[PDB]
Design an enzyme around this catalytic site. Structure first.
Site, PDB file in Angstrom:
ATOM      1  CB  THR A  96       1.938   1.655   6.582  1.00 18.64           C
ATOM      2  OG1 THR A  96       0.531   1.798   6.342  1.00 18.64           O
ATOM      3  CG2 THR A  96       2.289   2.368   7.875  1.00 18.64           C
TER       4      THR A  96
ATOM      5  CD1 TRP B 231      -7.349  -1.079   4.264  1.00 18.32           C
ATOM      6  CD2 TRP B 231      -8.254  -2.243   5.954  1.00 18.32           C
ATOM      7  NE1 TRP B 231      -7.110  -0.386   5.429  1.00 18.32           N
ATOM      8  CE2 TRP B 231      -7.652  -1.083   6.479  1.00 18.32           C
ATOM      9  CE3 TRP B 231      -8.899  -3.125   6.827  1.00 18.32           C
ATOM     10  CZ2 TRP B 231      -7.675  -0.786   7.842  1.00 18.32           C
ATOM     11  CZ3 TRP B 231      -8.914  -2.835   8.170  1.00 18.32           C
ATOM     12  CH2 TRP B 231      -8.307  -1.675   8.666  1.00 18.32           C
TER      13      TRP B 231
ATOM     14  CD  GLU C  10      -6.387  -8.235  -8.883  1.00 23.19           C
ATOM     15  OE1 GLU C  10      -6.376  -6.997  -8.659  1.00 23.19           O
ATOM     16  OE2 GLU C  10      -7.441  -8.869  -9.113  1.00 23.19           O
TER      17      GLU C  10
ATOM     18  CE  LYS D 166      -3.795   1.288  -1.021  1.00 24.10           C
ATOM     19  NZ  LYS D 166      -4.217   0.346   0.024  1.00 24.10           N
TER      20      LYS D 166
ATOM     21  CB  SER E 180      -0.961   0.045   1.191  1.00 25.02           C
ATOM     22  OG  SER E 180      -1.953  -0.956   1.091  1.00 25.02           O
TER      23      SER E 180
HETATM   24  B1  LIG Z   1      -2.040  -2.034   2.057  1.00 24.12           B
HETATM   25  O1  LIG Z   1      -0.734  -2.605   2.240  1.00 24.12           O
HETATM   26  O2  LIG Z   1      -2.567  -1.341   3.291  1.00 24.12           O
HETATM   27  C1  LIG Z   1      -3.858  -1.830   3.690  1.00 24.12           C
HETATM   28  C2  LIG Z   1      -3.972  -2.092   5.183  1.00 24.12           C
HETATM   29  N1  LIG Z   1      -3.101  -3.221   5.541  1.00 24.12           N
HETATM   30  S1  LIG Z   1      -3.206  -3.935   6.972  1.00 24.12           S
HETATM   31  O3  LIG Z   1      -2.203  -4.951   7.085  1.00 24.12           O
HETATM   32  O4  LIG Z   1      -2.868  -2.788   7.788  1.00 24.12           O
HETATM   33  N2  LIG Z   1      -4.726  -4.534   7.211  1.00 24.12           N
HETATM   34  C3  LIG Z   1      -5.449  -4.298   8.464  1.00 24.12           C
HETATM   35  C4  LIG Z   1      -6.332  -5.553   8.579  1.00 24.12           C
HETATM   36  C5  LIG Z   1      -6.608  -5.999   7.156  1.00 24.12           C
HETATM   37  C6  LIG Z   1      -5.439  -5.491   6.318  1.00 24.12           C
HETATM   38  C7  LIG Z   1      -4.124  -3.005   2.783  1.00 24.12           C
HETATM   39  C8  LIG Z   1      -5.161  -3.922   2.878  1.00 24.12           C
HETATM   40  C9  LIG Z   1      -5.230  -4.983   2.004  1.00 24.12           C
HETATM   41  C10 LIG Z   1      -4.268  -5.144   1.042  1.00 24.12           C
HETATM   42  C11 LIG Z   1      -3.231  -4.236   0.946  1.00 24.12           C
HETATM   43  C12 LIG Z   1      -3.131  -3.144   1.820  1.00 24.12           C
END
Ligand SMILES: *[B@@]1([O])O[C]([C][N]S(=O)(=O)N2[C][C][C][C]2)C2=[C][C]=[C][C]=C21
Length: 271
Positions: free
Chosen positions: A212, A82, A145, A50, A47
């Site tokens: 993050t 999410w 993906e 983003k 992520s």
């Molecule tokens: B991307 O990396 O950021 C979000 C949130 N990720 S997480 O690990 O913080 N999360 C909290 C519980 C479920 C997921 C995310 C979510 C899905 C895929 C990529 C990302």
């Protein structure tokens, strides 16, 4: 080179205990001194793209004076897993600015895909990164993906060094105009998902913004941040991890520990 790794830090022991690989680049923007470990290796963005996505939207808003205020409606089919903010506005829509804030501050996946569409997809975000001089970044796929984090796969990766270099250009340099630059900084400062990563190494009385990434497989997670220690120039840094096995778990503590080592290597007394 002369100002890189003036003080060695035990990153190798840290990654060995973690069971994987850690990549770190940290830049003291005052002196140009750096800490660098596996800094030119590729790691999955997860992520973390983003943040750059929101910066690309801000850049486009410099030529479209009304982009950020544009209301975006979307259907239930846009709401992938999410999407904590956009699911609460499914029946109303959200503005481009609100989607950008959600993508940055809650890592909202539906918001990220909607904004990617606005930019012309993964190649459009990649083109924005090329336009600021980043030849390493590549986004190839959409959410979810792009999180596959397959060992050796360059899709949807960058390097800690290029992440830090681009983050510096966008938050402190001239890649965005001044109002947009401060909006990007403010979105990063408002992130809610990073309290156990770089922020855990940063004293509470210093300003900090971060984004993050967590892929969910291959021990792959990351964070990048701009940090303003009081009384000196800001620090920009990136900490990325991965591990060899699909079931390997990521560690927030390892990211925080690596950030501490980077700050210590730069001589920035704090944590
Ligand atoms: B991307 O990396 O950021 C979000 C949130 N990720 S997480 O690990 O913080 N999360 C909290 C519980 C479920 C997921 C995310 C979510 C899905 C895929 C990529 C990302």
């Amino acid at each position: 080179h002369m100002l890189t790794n003036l003080v060695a830090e035990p990153f190798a022991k840290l990654e060995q205990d973690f069971g994987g690989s850690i990549g770190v680049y940290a830049m003291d923007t005052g002196s140009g001194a750096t800490v660098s470990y596996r800094a030119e290796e590729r790691f999955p963005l997860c992520s973390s793209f983003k943040g750059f996505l929101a910066a690309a939207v801000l850049a486009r808003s410099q030529q479209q004076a009304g982009l950020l205020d544009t209301p975006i409606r979307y259907g239930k089919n846009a709401l992938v897993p999410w999407s904590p903010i956009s699911e609460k506005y499914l029946t109303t829509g959200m503005t481009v600015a609100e989607l950008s804030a959600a993508a940055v501050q809650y890592s909202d996946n539906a918001a990220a895909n909607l904004l990617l569409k606005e930019l012309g997809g993964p190649a459009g975000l990649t083109a924005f990164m090329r336009s600021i001089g980043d030849t390493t970044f590549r986004l190839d796929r959409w959410e979810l993906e792009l999180n596959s984090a397959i060992p050796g796969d360059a899709r949807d990766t960058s390097s800690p060094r290029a992440v830090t270099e681009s983050l510096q250009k966008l938050t402190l340099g001239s890649a965005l105009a001044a109002p947009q630059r401060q909006q990007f900084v403010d979105w990063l400062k408002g992130n809610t998902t990073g309290n156990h990563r770089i922020r855990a190494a940063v004293p509470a009385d210093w300003a900090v913004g971060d984004k993050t990434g967590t892929c969910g497989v291959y021990g792959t997670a990351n964070d990048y941040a701009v940090v303003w220690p009081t009384g000196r120039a800001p620090i920009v840094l990136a900490v990325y991890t991965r591990a060899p096995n699909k079931d390997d778990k990521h560690s927030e503590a390892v990211i925080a520990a690596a950030a501490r080592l980077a700050l210590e290597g730069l001589g920035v007394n704090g944590q």
